[PDB]
Design a protein around this ligand. Structure first.
Ligand SMILES: [Mg+2]
Ligand SMILES: [Mg+2]
Ligand SMILES: [Mg+2]
Ligand SMILES: [Mg+2]
Ligand SMILES: [Mg+2]
Ligand SMILES: [Mg+2]
Ligand SMILES: [Zn+2]
Ligand SMILES: [Zn+2]
Ligand SMILES: [Zn+2]
Ligand SMILES: [Zn+2]
Ligand SMILES: [Zn+2]
Ligand SMILES: [Zn+2]
Lengths: 104, 104
DNA sequence: GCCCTGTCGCTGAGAAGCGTTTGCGT
DNA sequence: GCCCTGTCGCTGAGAAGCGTTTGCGT
């Protein structure tokens, strides 16, 4: 299988450092092929904090969104999403507008 | 990867025995977990001859249909499909009416 | 030029087959 | 009953991240 396992992170396990590491400008991202995480929207693998979809039916990394992409494409803040126990990713809500999902 | 490789069989390599082995009644199928092939429509893995999708963009076993399913669900004969160099499976044509594909 | 500082292309990827499985009531 | 002899449920499955990548011309 090519799919990375999806693990749901509880809201009470979100730390201050992770909140401070949410990207505020896409040009300031730090790339890392091993420790980074890929944002579903912009498809860049970087070390900034990204969202975690808490829908049990979600899979893979489709639920991971960076700071700028979540606010610019959906008007939501990553910090609010990380502290929301019922937050579902735009792919799970069927409203993703990335270049791949809006084709069909 | 869980996907079986898709191999396109040329029309000139279809033999008489394979044509004679096309299923004419679903109750007469012979099941075999190792040598059988799965029909996409009825999801039964049997030894009767099934279609081969010749679209290069096809993948997996979605293009394999048994005799009764092809004629009853799409009005096409497996023998005609096997001898058609440009035959595409109903999933490739977006007209599949199996229980999984017609949901969405 | 303006303010809200932003994004898509490409490769290879995209289940399969078991059990609980065989038409409609027009 | 009829003729054309038929089909769905369930489990686990359903990419990810590289390069060619950063708003519109209203
Ligand atoms: Mg391939
Ligand atoms: Mg069986
Ligand atoms: Mg009815
Ligand atoms: Mg799973
Ligand atoms: Mg790179
Ligand atoms: Mg324009
Ligand atoms: Zn992003
Ligand atoms: Zn999700
Ligand atoms: Zn998307
Ligand atoms: Zn079949
Ligand atoms: Zn096909
Ligand atoms: Zn189908």
């Amino acid at each position: 299988s090519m799919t990375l396992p999806h693990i749901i992170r509880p809201v009470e396990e979100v730390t201050e450092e992770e909140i401070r590491n949410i990207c505020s400008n896409s040009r300031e991202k730090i790339y890392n092929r091993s420790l980074g995480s890929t944002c579903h929207q912009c498809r860049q693998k970087t070390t900034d904090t990204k969202t975690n979809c808490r829908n049990p039916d979600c899979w893979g990394i489709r639920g991971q969104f960076c700071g700028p992409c979540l606010r610019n494409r959906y008007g939501e803040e990553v910090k609010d999403a990380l502290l929301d126990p019922n937050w579902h990713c735009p792919p799970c809500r069927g409203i993703c507008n990335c270049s791949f999902c809006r084709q069909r």
